[PDB]
Write a protein that binds this ligand. Structure first.
Ligand SMILES: *Cc1c(COP(=O)(O)O)cnc(C)c1O
Ligand SMILES: *Cc1c(COP(=O)(O)O)cnc(C)c1O
Ligand SMILES: [Cl-]
Ligand SMILES: [Cl-]
Lengths: 355, 355
């Protein structure tokens, strides 16, 4: 059989080169990098090369940190709770601004901070499916400890005005964090242009393994560790390093940035072919703006039949997609989809819809 | 060349069967287990089997939780900070008792809680290298939120009186957590006999991959999540599951408990052969008790030459061991060491010592 995977904003396939580069550290190179003997220092060159790939992947400077975490959820929890202790409890800046579109790892943590007494304003989305940047400014009081706005939304693919939010935060002296998970491998990511203090990402959204992530911390910026222990990652995140996943995630970031032109010109062309073909049937409307989007995502809405039925049908024909709040059908492509797959999805989608 | 790895309390080699069982989930079975389509539910049987292996591995009940974490450091941080919010800030039980022998993931986090105003007593070790259990009782005031005592020490191999501490905690109504990382695969681990509310472990200490751990939470016991997001692990720990490492860690726990007789009878016999051979030279004394120890660990001290020099020398001859606070030389064996390796280590150790 031949199945079609169109659920890449939920997770992606590991690139074969990533698995290949991870294998030796699952085999004979199992030393703890903190060890002083040869099994430990034996791992240091590959770890350094992987970290270098990450730094260059997000345009991080040598003075900055790219701390290895276990997923984007850890990065987001670490940002929000760290600034809760450093900037909210100790500096009296008991206010955080974020958006209603943020991943549950951000919104649920913000709810937890609210339970402790922190004041959090979740900026409402507009009809364009985006946040303006004027909204954060309206909400940035002199007690805002942190602004947290995701770079690209996982349900609609919509790109938020990261850069202008960073400029507002820079002029107003408030820390800026961006959840950039959906942006890696989709659009160019530059922490300097974003003026980001914190940036989150997760490997399994750009063809690395599930269970490893990264938090960019700007030079000089403090953040009380979420993982105390003080051994690893310059004492900022303790725990024995996941060497294979570090190497693999480095390679995945490298491949992801190397495929940016292909992502916009080819994957985006497949998404536009799919979307244009799919809107030529009854009343199926795309949910959100069609310009400020990452190249791989389309979110289509169909009459009065729920999206879950359409997805159950698609899955019966071995086509995997997800839902999306509008419910609508989220189809998210990748580097490994082909035009034949897209034509097939147009046919199976139409036949399933009329049925 | 033929190198000798005697540093297994620092980390271990992945069992070939563990790598084998992980490989398919690094290849074609890359679905997100939260997905509703076939790529997601396709992973559910192997995840369930792995979790079953963990539960049976620590004698957890079906009503209990064995939450998948990213390492023992995450489990320990989660226990201590969770009971800080639930039992210290909300219930006024602003006291925690632990030991001075605990891993830095516990002691450093306790230091962080002290910086917030929590009163923590670190029980001092005695001349026997152990904690009595009478000490926790002496310190268990009616404001103790948590007792945290490691099952086996990583530097000396000494087993602490887990069970009696659990009985004291049960009679006095105080939560009991045990860091059991060094115990898995070394001695039988039973959360019921221990009367443990929380138990930590980490795969790479029993031949699973680095970067995954487990926290046993007793039925009914609450613990505010460290990873908010509320999606995965019954909402107790959010983040996309590390499917390959979950499967591998399950197999590693199974193999580890299946080798307990071999660990005590063979690995312990190799440790006793090594230790008895090594104490027949000048004034090299074993640091700590020689009865209440896990079968794989020996911690030897040598005259007035520091341990780091002896270990640099050993590493020059491709023999990997670590230091240990006494500094002494920690040699920690495993299922994969042979008697030939041990004889060779006796010779190289003697020649290095006289040189
Ligand atoms: C090794 C060890 C740890 C650290 O585990 P990580 O996987 O590095 O998080 C914690 N406690 C004990 C007793 C250990 O031996
Ligand atoms: C998928 C996603 C996450 C969750 O990442 P995990 O690896 O599951 O921790 C967080 N934020 C965004 C924007 C995501 O798309
Ligand atoms: Cl914290
Ligand atoms: Cl928490």
């Amino acid at each position: 059989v031949q199945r079609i995977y169109l659920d890449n904003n939920a997770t992606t396939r590991i690139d074969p080169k990533v698995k290949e580069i991870m294998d030796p550290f699952l085999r004979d190179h199992y030393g703890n990098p903190s060890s002083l003997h040869q099994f430990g220092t034996e791992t240091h060159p590959a770890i350094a090369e992987a970290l270098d790939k990450l730094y260059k992947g997000i345009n991080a400077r040598d003075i900055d940190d790219v701390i290895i975490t276990s997923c984007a959820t850890e990065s987001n929890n670490w940002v929000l709770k760290g600034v809760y202790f450093d900037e909210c409890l100790k500096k009296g800046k008991n206010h955080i601004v974020t958006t209603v579109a943020e991943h549950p790892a951000v919104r649920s943590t913000c709810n937890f901070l609210e339970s402790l007494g922190v004041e959090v304003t979740y900026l409402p989305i507009n009809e364009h499916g985006s946040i303006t940047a004027e909204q954060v400014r309206e909400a940035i009081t002199e007690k805002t400890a942190l602004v947290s706005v995701m770079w690209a939304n996982n349900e609609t693919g919509l790109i938020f005005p990261i850069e202008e939010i960073g400029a507002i935060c820079k002029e107003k002296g408030v820390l800026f964090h961006t959840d950039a998970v959906q942006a890696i491998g989709k659009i160019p990511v530059d922490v300097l242009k974003a003026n980001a203090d914190f940036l989150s990402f997760s490997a399994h959204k750009f063809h690395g393994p599930k269970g490893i992530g990264g938090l960019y911390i700007r030079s000089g910026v403090g953040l009380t560790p979420l993982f105390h222990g003080g051994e690893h990652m310059n004492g900022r995140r303790s725990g024995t390093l996941n060497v294979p996943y570090i190497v693999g995630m480095g390679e995945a970031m490298k491949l992801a940035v190397e495929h940016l032109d292909y992502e916009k010109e080819v994957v985006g062309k497949l998404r536009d072919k799919l979307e244009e073909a799919l809107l030529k049937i009854p009343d199926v409307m795309v949910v959100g703006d069609r310009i400020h989007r990452v190249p791989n995502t389309t979110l289509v809405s169909v009459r009065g039949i729920e999206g879950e039925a359409m997805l159950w049908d698609l899955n019966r024909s071995n086509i995997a997609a997800s839902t999306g709040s509008a419910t609508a059908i989220r189809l998210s492509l990748s580097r490994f989809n082909t035009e034949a797959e897209i034509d097939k999805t147009i046919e199976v989608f139409s036949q399933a819809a009329v049925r």
